[PDB]
Design a protein around this ligand. Structure first.
Ligand SMILES: CC(=O)N[C@@H]1[C@@H](O)[C@H](O[C@@H]2O[C@H](CO)[C@@H](O[C@@H]3O[C@H](CO)[C@@H](O)[C@H](O[C@H]4O[C@H](CO)[C@@H](O)[C@H](O)[C@@H]4O[C@@H]4O[C@H](CO)[C@@H](O)[C@H](O)[C@H]4NC(C)=O)[C@@H]3O)[C@H](O)[C@H]2NC(C)=O)[C@@H](CO)O[C@H]1O
Ligand code: GDP
Ligand code: GDP
Lengths: 467, 467
């Protein structure tokens, strides 16, 4: 055992005890207070708590890094990335393209970039499970009629032709076993659904992923995003120039403010203060472990009027943003190459940030979060979503397993016994989540800490020929 | 890295986050409440917090045991105990007693048992540092004029005689370098003081002890307590019989209620409910990790009227206690052999408990806590004192090091800068401690989590010939 490891384990332990002592004392005092006297004492209480809590989260971070734990995790995560990218690349480049089994994917799903991009990942992940090379049809793409290679590398160097001796629409892996070329529709109309879908992960990688990553389901998705978004040279160069142009440096926290057409249809309007309370919080945590020269924020939004508002309200912050990109994201000009290049750039810098504050109901932020997983060993917790938990459109039921019992205090809560399977709908970021107790068919709230994630595994191919 | 180790570290991490989510939300709710509604909401809040907090402490326990950490810590602590006991036995049994260097200690210090026992421990630690054999004079002992061997084994098998060519009173290790037999007074009037005192530890054991034990200073003391209290055969049998008669079995929590002459002089009167809130708390913690057949408590007290009160007020508890021993602890019969054997038994069963709730102002509980350290790898946190932190009468200044800054919110608090040395006087068990900032000469309260223990080391002899 490590000297610093035990020191840290005990400092975290004792720090929690003192926190419990602190809580009990101040609450007993609070029960005897009223009005402003009550409200000021509660505010001072909250300030003191945040620092204490952050001291514990800092000791927890150090524990995750002490005694070579950080060095090992990066090497293993690196070995895992290399392995998958090696298998994907092998699958994507058969010797004889005319005789390879293929799966055709059409990019023109009726939605935005991140949603269309997730369609390709959904296509790619099933092509992986079926040992079929992915063929991506991207002509007449709404962001770029020139197609996929307007921005990114082709998904294959040897097999980009879709010809085959037999062709047909999706009907099942078994039924299509002797069909060379299979056309795959969007997940919304996929029947029958195969098991190669989120949030499951390859059975052969399950044990290694749990040791490294706090959310393997996102990591698995990120591996296909990592492959797809290989930039064309001019795009690679422009990212390199934008990085230098915007003075993009660390430490930096990424913020995605999705407004415009999303409001009133798939999400709500969130004031800028709802985002910045968590940015400031995180900078207070990082300050506990390093020197914060300047409080930097990369702001990605389709509201071009927001940057002036933000700079006005937070003058001690350095806001890094491309307002012309935000303007290009406008509804009247959203579906062009220039706007496409804009959102690609914004997502890149969001993914490169040290922390991500946004709304996961927007696919733009979910992509940045996914890419982030490829830049760090375990960046699963390096975010805060103002609404939805992480999800992938079309995923199988996101389930959890109750580990502690719960008796409802109100009719709006649901009971839980250890072992109950809970299908989570979301986290309210108030200590409570919302979901259904499948055993009872009741829906309602439950404490977010009394459940555990039910990790799903699928027997994927392992492509041993790629070594 | 171990799979379960990482799972636990992340679950501790997330549990703290969800606790932080829970706190902010419910506090925001509390600021808008009044009257009974306010007090009901705070009480329900505390119930939810205790369980949540205990769920985190349980995972922290598992972390201390995962991946063979429990087996290693148990093995290492065993080798350290055997090593020190091997050295002590070597020092205490020279071949030629007539030529050995000796240090004479008289047991009849004017105080109770635990205080007199600490006198011998204080004598023993200095004899150890000076490479002198301890000769214990225990005639006219107030609990047993027959002497030390009425209950315990002699401290030496070869050298119990005090003869020597030169004798003198204590005057310094340097001045006594050629004085064979040195007489040592009580610490309260000791001049000059040697460095072989609590709460310092041998320089050669610092790294190994910090790695294993959460409070090395107590472990060091416990090694001398362990040696002294080696029971005579008839005493060993009596304990074995009492264990069987009292149905002493696990799980069990030890409770020491010191009253009578202590109240109003060296401590305060504490109702039984103040003790049982922490007993119940821990049984709620233990239930999270094991099957708790029955909530057992071993009650040691000098108030013979207390046992019936407890049985009446807590009918769901099984109280193990010998009331005739409590009667023997009365002021008119305190200093007899029958009473002496009684308190020895009480301390034994207190030390054997899985947790110790008491007042550390009573030397009776400090001995049980020390002995407890010899029964487990790291039992440093297996206690709760209603008043004083751990201390050893005559210790050098117990100092701490501030790790986080603090700005006083009231005049009753003191400021701290990181690295400042703070002389601790005690912990108020409410999130605040009390002490003096030696850099400023200011005394007052400060957050208990912003400080770190300054572990002190002393170059003791190592007795390499004992191998
Ligand atoms: C000549 C002779 O033979 N002398 C012996 C003594 O050696 C023998 O033992 C001595 O007993 C005393 C008192 O039991 C003990 O003193 C303590 O030393 C502690 C360490 O420095 C110190 O912290 C203690 O002070 C607390 O308690 C006293 C009251 O006893 C209060 O007045 C103080 O304010 C302290 O109160 C604590 O304060 C903190 C912070 O405010 C609180 O967190 C905590 O809850 C408070 N606790 C209480 C109970 O209020 C105390 O001064 C000696 O260490 C000890 N010495 C030795 C060598 O054993 C004595 C035993 O009866 O008999 C004499 O004949
Ligand atoms: N450049 C840029 N474009 C954005 C931003 N937010 C939204 N957009 C545009 O709006 C589209 C929304 O499509 P989508 O990726 O499916 O995300 P969602 O509809 O918010 O879930 C994006 O693809 C962009 O074209 C932004 O912050 N920056
Ligand atoms: N048998 C028994 N005796 C006790 C108990 N509590 C106190 N006493 C007696 O009271 C004395 C107190 O002396 P001491 O050990 O120096 O500790 P302190 O005065 O409580 O700090 C003890 O030595 C016992 O003789 C108890 O729980 N059981």
């Amino acid at each position: 055992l490590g000297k610093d490891h035990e020191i840290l384990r005990r400092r975290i332990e004792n720090g929690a005890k003192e926190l419990w002592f602190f809580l009990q004392s101040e609450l007993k005092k609070l029960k005897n207070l009223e009005g402003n006297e009550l409200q000021r004492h509660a505010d001072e209480f909250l300030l003191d708590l945040g620092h204490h809590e952050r001291s514990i989260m800092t000791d927890l971070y150090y524990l995750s890094q002490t005694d070579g734990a950080g060095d090992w995790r990066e090497k293993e995560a690196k070995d895992l990335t290399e392995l998958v990218q090696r298998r994907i690349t092998y699958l994507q480049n058969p010797k004889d393209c005319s005789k390879a089994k293929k799966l055709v994917c059409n990019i023109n799903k009726g939605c935005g970039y991140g949603c269309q991009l997730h369609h390709v990942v959904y296509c790619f992940m099933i092509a992986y499970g079926t040992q079929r090379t992915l063929i991506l049809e991207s002509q007449n793409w709404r962001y770029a009629t020139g197609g996929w290679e307007t921005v990114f590398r082709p998904v294959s160097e040897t097999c980009t032709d879709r010809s085959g001796i037999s062709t047909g629409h999706w009907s099942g892996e078994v039924k299509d076993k002797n069909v060379q070329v299979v056309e795959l529709p969007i997940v919304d109309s996929l029947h029958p659904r195969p098991p190669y879908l989120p949030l499951a992960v390859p059975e052969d990688l399950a044990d290694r992923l749990v040791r490294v990553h706090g959310d393997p389901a996102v990591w698995w998705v990120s591996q296909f995003v990592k492959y797809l978004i290989r930039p064309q040279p001019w795009l690679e160069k422009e990212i390199e120039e934008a990085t230098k142009k915007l003075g993009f440096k660390h430490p930096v926290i990424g913020v995605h403010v999705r407004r415009t057409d999303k409001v009133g249809t798939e999400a709500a309007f969130h004031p800028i203060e709802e985002y910045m309370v968590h940015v400031e919080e995180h900078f207070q945590l990082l300050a506990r472990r390093m020197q914060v020269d300047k409080k930097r924020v990369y702001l990605a939004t389709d509201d071009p009027s927001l940057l002036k508002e933000a700079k006005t309200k937070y003058p001690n912050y350095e806001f890094i943003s491309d307002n012309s990109i935000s303007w290009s994201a406008g509804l009247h000009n959203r579906y062009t190459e220039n706007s496409l290049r804009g959102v690609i750039l914004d997502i890149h810098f969001l993914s490169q940030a040290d922390f991500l504050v946004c709304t996961f109901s927007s696919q733009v932020c979910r992509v940045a979060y996914e890419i982030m997983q490829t830049l760090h060993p375990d960046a699963s917790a390096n975010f805060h979503s103002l609404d939805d938990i992480y999800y992938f459109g079309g995923q199988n039921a996101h389930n959890q397993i109750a580990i502690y019992a719960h008796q409802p205090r109100t009719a709006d809560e649901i009971p839980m016994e250890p072992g109950d399977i809970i299908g989570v709908a979301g986290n309210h970021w108030d200590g409570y989540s919302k979901g259904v107790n499948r055993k009872l068919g009741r829906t309602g709230l439950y404490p977010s800490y009394k459940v555990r994630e039910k990790i799903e595994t699928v027997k994927y191919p392992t492509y041993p020929e790629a070594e």
